[PDB]
Amino acid sequence: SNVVEPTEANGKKSHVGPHLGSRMRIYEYSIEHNDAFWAEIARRDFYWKTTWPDDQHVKSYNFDKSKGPIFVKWFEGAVTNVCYNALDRHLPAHKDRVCFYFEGNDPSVTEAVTYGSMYTRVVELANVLKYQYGIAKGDRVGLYLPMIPFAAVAMLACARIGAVITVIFGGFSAQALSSRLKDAQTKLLITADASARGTKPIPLKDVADEALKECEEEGMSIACLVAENMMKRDTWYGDALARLTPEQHEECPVEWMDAEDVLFLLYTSGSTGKPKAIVHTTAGYMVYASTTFMYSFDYHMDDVYFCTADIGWITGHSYVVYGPMIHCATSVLFEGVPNYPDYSRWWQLVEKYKVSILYTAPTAIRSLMQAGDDYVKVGNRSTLRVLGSVGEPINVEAWKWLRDVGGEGHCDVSDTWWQTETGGHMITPMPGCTPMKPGSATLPFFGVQPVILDPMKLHEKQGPAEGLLAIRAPWPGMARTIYGDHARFEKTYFGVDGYYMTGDGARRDSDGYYWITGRVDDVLNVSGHRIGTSEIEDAVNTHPAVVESAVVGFPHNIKGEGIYVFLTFRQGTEVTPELLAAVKATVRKVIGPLATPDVMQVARVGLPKTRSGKIVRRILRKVSAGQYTELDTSTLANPDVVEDLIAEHQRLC
């Protein structure tokens, strides 16, 4: 009864078919004939300077430590370029087709960027990187940009010449930006003078200057290219253009890449330690991101697509730039926020550009729900037919609101589960063919074999089951390693021979539908952003008066999960609102606003530790959630902390 059937119109329009059988027939084929399946997709849908030698052997891999090093290769011996598949090959047939319907935060700032215009922008920038900054195949380029056309231009210019990009979310502090540039050893930083988020100025160049001063004090010598959106080492993009020759505006050769040449680095939070650079290569990621974009959203050439994610996250890589452009999509590119000038903004964009596919996140949805349906009903949503959710679980009422108010009830919802490490969608509905259970990711994508591993015995559980979500077989979009640390990669994701461990928990029901329960490690999902507890603790501890801290998640009604901080101060410290405010500001300096603690509790007699000195985080998880029952607390070094924490927490309410 908790099932919503797809719309008949989406069934008639589906690339797959009108019935679930149409999807299952394809899926079983993608599993029984994995090589042939991906060989047909890659050959039908992409351009190759050179094709893999044998369609029988389009992949090789090892998911078992005990047999040797973990590895995965797709389309070995193939040669291609991501920029060529995203731009050049669409020309001249789709020269005048709109790539990005761009709007700034200021609604009077708009720009309809065609694929032809993207080409000019990319070759110009690519020639600047080549002949003015000496960017070569393999060189790392950092991006610190807002959601403007230049951000996609920069990712494709680097891809055109073989450069490895690393995108730093424009909301990260200077220290956060500095750390990522150093670890990637970037030759160049591309940024913009500033951006806007409502009425708040986002001066990006000034932050970047603080990051660069820090890198230069550490020995580095990083160049900076600055686009004018609203100066040492620092060159304005206009000055660089003025140095280009007329032919350098027209033409730039494509650097043809091998299947496993690196495409980008993306720093991702983990259960322990600082964020690590996840490494994605060329051929496999290209095929998987574009193929998932096509089927998970049933994109057709007459659709208009709008993803609200930032390029600084994997969602923006795969489903704002790389994926959509490779399938010659017409997309909306929005620099601003959903509540400026008011909360109708996204719906004004939907009718203005006749959007038919909208890809957003539960946190944004729940924010829109707090503002009133009237902010939605003033815009025309008759063109919407597919709605997408990503980043974290979506509750039933939010799912129903999205489809019924947002989509006027004539939409299919694709709640897609996946990760930075998976490259693209892994469990997702497909419009027209997949029955929907509100809150469920439903069925695995073509060529994906998920499993539920028993938490204690680490065996696969048949039929309905709850446990650890794992992937028992490789897929083209899988991350290949961690930058300069394959051992950490093997330990983190392949501790169970034969499986990729996702770090999520999930339940599978009697129809084979998957329900993702959230992280099972020390990783938080705060406002759809992935953040680790260890790095928040390290930031909290940098405050001169903080001795020790412990960070746990706890339930929140908009962000899903909030950040709860237990901390002890230096002796003789007067705890005041200002002090606690200065500690919040310390996290925002070290990391950024996305990691702002929500609650800060003083462990008045200390943090709960075992006799051996290990913090008992389960006790902190239970206290922050108000569960005072499931706590033996006598193995503690100081058992009296429990009543201190329960009391101080109730005093805070």
Ligand X SMILES: C[As](C)(=O)[O-]
Ligand Y SMILES: CCOP(=O)(O)OC[C@H]1O[C@@H](n2cnc3c(N)ncnc32)[C@H](O)[C@@H]1O
Residue 392 binding ligand Y, by CB under 6 A: yes
**Part of the chain binding ligand Y (CB under 6 A), chosen from 72-80, 370-378, 413-421, 531-539:** 413-421
To ligand X, the closest distance from the beta carbon of 650 in angstroms equals 33
Residue with the CB atom nearest Cl ion in the bound state:
21
Residue 268 binding ligand Y, by CB under 6 A: yes
Q: How far is CA 497 from the centre of its chain?
A: 27
To Cl ion, the closest distance from the beta carbon of 394 in angstroms equals 19
φ and ψ at 583, to 5 degrees? Answer: -75, -40
339 is in an annotated binding site: no
Residue 419 binding ligand Y, by CB under 6 A: yes
Residue 418 binding ligand Y, by CB under 6 A: yes
What dihedral do alpha carbons 117, 119, 124, 129 form, nearest 10°?
A: 140
Q: Which helix (H) or strand (E) holds 239?
A: helix 237-243
300 binds, among Cl ion, ligand X, ligand Y, none (CB under 5 to 8 A by kind): ligand X
φ and ψ at 314, to 5 degrees? Answer: -60, -30
Burial class (CB in 10 A: 0-12, 13-18, 19+), 452: buried
Of 290, 292, 420, 481, the residue at the interface with ligand Y (CB under 6 A) is 420
Q: CB nearer to ligand Y: give 178 or 268.
A: 268
Q: Residues 441 to 460: which contact ligand Y by CB under 6 A?
A: 441
Residue with the CB atom nearest ligand Y in the bound state:
420
Q: CB nearer to ligand X: give 183 or 310.
A: 310
Residue 590 binding ligand Y, by CB under 6 A: no
By CB under 6 A, the count of residues binding ligand Y is 23
* Residue ranges that bind Cl ion, judged by CB under 5 A: 19-21, 34, 464, 509-510, 593
Q: CB nearer to ligand X: give 302 or 632.
A: 302
**CA atoms of 83 and 162, how far apart (whole Å):** 10
Contact 240, 132 (CB under 8 A): yes
φ and ψ at 490, to 5 degrees? Answer: -65, -45
Q: CB nearer to ligand X: give 313 or 343.
A: 313
Contact 188, 132 (CB under 8 A): no
Strand 529-532 relative to strand 523-526: parallel, antiparallel, unpaired?
Answer: antiparallel
To Cl ion, the closest distance from the beta carbon of 546 in angstroms equals 14
**Part of the chain binding ligand Y (CB under 6 A), chosen from 405-413, 415-423, 460-468, 538-546:** 415-423
Q: CB nearer to ligand Y: give 424 or 447.
A: 424
What dihedral do alpha carbons 454, 459, 462, 463 form, nearest 10°?
A: 20
Q: Which amino acid is at 652?
A: L
> Which residues lie below 8 Å from residue 21, measured CB to CB, with a gap of 6+?
none
To ligand Y, the closest distance from the beta carbon of 270 in angstroms equals 10
415 is in an annotated binding site: yes
To ligand Y, the closest distance from the beta carbon of 429 in angstroms equals 11
Q: How many CB atoms lie within 10 A of CB 15?
A: 15
Residue 314 binding ligand Y, by CB under 6 A: yes
19 binds, among ligand Y, ligand X, Cl ion, none (CB under 5 to 8 A by kind): Cl ion
Look at the chain and count its residues: 653
Q: Helices H, strands E: what count in the chain?
A: 22, 30
To ligand Y, the closest distance from the beta carbon of 407 in angstroms equals 18
To ligand X, the closest distance from the beta carbon of 221 in angstroms equals 31
Q: CB nearer to ligand X: give 296 or 308.
A: 308
**CA atoms of 221 and 186, how far apart (whole Å):** 9
Q: CB nearer to Cl ion: give 132 or 596.
A: 596
Q: CB nearer to Cl ion: give 59 or 130.
A: 59
530 is in an annotated binding site: yes
**CA atoms of 230 and 457, how far apart (whole Å):** 57
**CA atoms of 205 and 207, how far apart (whole Å):** 5
* DSSP for residue 260: T
Residue 361 binding ligand Y, by CB under 6 A: no
Q: CB nearer to ligand X: give 505 or 528.
A: 528
Q: How many CB atoms lie within 10 A of CB 98?
A: 18
Residue 519 binding ligand Y, by CB under 6 A: yes
Of 121, 140, 205, 530, the residue at the interface with ligand Y (CB under 6 A) is 530
Q: How far apart are the first and last CA of the chain?
A: 38
To ligand Y, the closest distance from the beta carbon of 653 in angstroms equals 29
To ligand Y, the closest distance from the beta carbon of 518 in angstroms equals 6
571 binds, among Cl ion, ligand X, ligand Y, none (CB under 5 to 8 A by kind): none
Residue 516 binding ligand Y, by CB under 6 A: yes
DSSP structure string for 275-329: -EEEEEESHHHHHHHHHHHHHHHT--TT-EEEE---TTSHHHIIIIIIHHHHTT-
- Three-state secondary structure string covering 462-515: CCCEEEEEEECCCCCCCCCEECCCHHHHHHHHCCCCCCEEEEEEEEECCCCCEE
Q: Is 450 helix (H, G, I), strand (E, B) or coil?
A: strand
525 is in an annotated binding site: yes
φ and ψ at 30, to 5 degrees? Answer: -65, -15
Q: CB nearer to ligand X: give 155 or 361.
A: 361
518 binds, among ligand Y, ligand X, Cl ion, none (CB under 5 to 8 A by kind): ligand Y
- The residues of the shown chain that bind ligand Y, judged by CB under 6 A, are 268, 313-315, 390-393, 415-420, 441, 502-504, 516, 518-519, 525, 530
Residues that constitute the known binding site for AMP = 391, 415-416, 419-420, 504, 519, 525, 530
Q: Which residues make up each annotated binding site?
A: 197, 200, 310, 391, 415-416, 419-420, 504, 519, 525, 530, 588
Residue list, annotated binding site for CoA = 197, 200, 310, 588
